[PDB]
Design an enzyme around this catalytic site. Structure first.
Site, mmCIF file in Angstrom:
data_model
loop_
_atom_site.group_PDB
_atom_site.id
_atom_site.type_symbol
_atom_site.label_atom_id
_atom_site.label_comp_id
_atom_site.label_asym_id
_atom_site.label_seq_id
_atom_site.Cartn_x
_atom_site.Cartn_y
_atom_site.Cartn_z
ATOM 1 N N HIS A 1 68.023 88.684 45.081
ATOM 2 C CA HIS A 1 66.690 88.771 45.688
ATOM 3 C C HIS A 1 66.741 89.629 46.958
ATOM 4 C CE1 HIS A 1 67.825 86.014 48.985
ATOM 5 N NE2 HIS A 1 68.466 85.300 48.067
ATOM 6 N N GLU B 1 69.288 79.368 43.086
ATOM 7 C CA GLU B 1 70.409 79.370 44.028
ATOM 8 C C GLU B 1 70.930 77.924 44.095
ATOM 9 O OE1 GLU B 1 72.818 80.692 45.263
ATOM 10 O OE2 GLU B 1 72.401 81.880 47.094
#
Length: 207
Positions: free
Chosen positions: A9, A82
């Protein structure tokens, strides 16, 4: 026979503030969006059949920018999230050092020793990330796809492909936001062709 492009990201607000995100999320910064667009331009010639992302806002936002209007579906999978960091989410490094110094040291220095009461261990992440990757390969025989995910996820995946123990999880290279990693899957084997390339990025920050 599948080609996998893996990335991270773009830069978020908490990345800048040195605040751990985990399953929590924060918006991309101006730099983040810029980097994500730079990546989209780099991949404009690559024939992507699909784009897979975690269900996190920052991952999805990065994926939309990279797609940039192109006719490519985006699929979201929780297994690409994550690492779940419980109580640490939303707090800065100093704040965390104040809370649990030992676990924090392990997180960065002895991954195999990291064992929180609330949250995932690196092995939990590696196992779900690899399952997601395998499911993606199984659905894209003979195709090329892009996977937008996160730092720890990417590191556990490289460790699996490079066949290295988790204690050496944080081995170089550093996975910068929007960095490019290419994996060639042939004969049931994962070959690392490119790892953490940032050729398309102007200013590289270790955030």
């Amino acid at each position: 026979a599948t080609t996998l492009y893996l990335t991270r990201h773009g830069e978020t607000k908490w990345n800048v503030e040195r605040r751990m995100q985990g399953w929590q999320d924060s918006p991309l910064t101006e730099k983040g969006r810029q980097d994500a667009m730079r990546l989209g331009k780099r991949l404009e010639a690559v024939e992507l059949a699909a784009i897979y992302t975690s269900t996190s806002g920052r991952a999805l936002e990065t994926a939309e920018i990279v797609r940039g209007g192109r006719l490519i579906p985006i699929y979201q999978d929780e297994r690409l999230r994550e690492i779940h960091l419980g109580d640490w989410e939303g707090k800065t490094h100093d704040e965390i050092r104040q809370m649990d110094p030992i676990a924090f040291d392990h997180f960065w220095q002895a991954p195999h020793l990291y064992a929180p009461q609330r949250g995932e261990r690196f092995c939990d992440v590696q196992q779900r990330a690899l399952e997601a990757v395998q499911s993606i390969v199984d659905r894209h025989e003979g195709e090329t796809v892009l996977i937008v995910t996160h730092g720890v996820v990417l590191k556990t995946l490289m460790a699996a492909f490079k066949d290295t123990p988790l204690d050496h999880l944080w081995s170089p290279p550093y996975m910068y936001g929007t960095s490019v990693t290419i994996i060639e899957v042939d004969g049931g084997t994962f070959h690392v062709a490119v790892e953490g390339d940032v050729s398309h990025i102007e200013e590289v920050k270790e955030v």
